[PDB]
Design a protein around this ligand. Sequence first.
Ligand SMILES: NS(=O)(=O)c1ccc(CCNc2ncnc(Cl)c2[N+](=O)[O-])cc1
Ligand SMILES: [Zn+2]
Length: 258
Amino acid sequence: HHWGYGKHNGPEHWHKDFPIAKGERQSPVDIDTHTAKYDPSLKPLSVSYDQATSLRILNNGHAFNVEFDDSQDKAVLKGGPLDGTYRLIQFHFHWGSLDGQGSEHTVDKKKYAAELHLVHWNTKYGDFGKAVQQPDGLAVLGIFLKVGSAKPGLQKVVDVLDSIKTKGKSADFTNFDPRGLLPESLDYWTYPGSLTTPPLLECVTWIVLKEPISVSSEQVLKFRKLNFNGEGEPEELMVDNWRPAQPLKNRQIKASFK
Ligand SMILES: NS(=O)(=O)c1ccc(CCNc2ncnc(Cl)c2[N+](=O)[O-])cc1
Ligand SMILES: [Zn+2]
């Protein structure tokens, strides 16, 4: 009986195995655009993905992760609100059963069709596993998806999904360029929070872009053909794998833009 999103094991149940679920800096949150303060000391985000090396894509039974070789100083995130340099390790999405829901963060309560998380760990902690143990260990760059025009840079990911339909399947996934998934503007909101899945650790500086990317209805439909179950188990479509907004508690959301 471990965690998931279904009835019986979804987000309102996670606190029983992961008490930090009701902690002081949980994610996601609703971004109240009128209350976020412009912070003229924030820097432009620096996203250096030219040398990114993807390795593999994996259906882990919650989502699919596109995994990177993070053994050298390649795909990094810095600047913005960050001190130091954070290294890309994987990306994944959260999406809905319908286009009216799916994102984890919301903007003035607006839910987008999906949300992309590019996960980076602080190189001062030497690896991902040690980083998640620190309050400034991770930087996750969150990008909203709306349904409209297709995102050509997404299509390679969409096409490999029928090879990892079920939990525990993986596939070779090299030379995937994540610059294809970024909107034009890097205007962002930022606040301190957590992993949005168990173990829900409070180790994340969240950077959420204001500009969504557009993906097609056929693209997001293919996400929804994935399965939560393993091969040879009864089919449970992989939909609604998002955690709802959690209490903001004392925290400030800062905006990089006027
Ligand atoms: N949705 S999100 O906030 O962007 C996000 C959620 C979860 C993760 C990592 C979850 N995996 C782990 N987390 C913590 N410790 C270990 Cl040791 C692992 N682990 O798997 O070995 C990364 C990002
Ligand atoms: Zn995520």
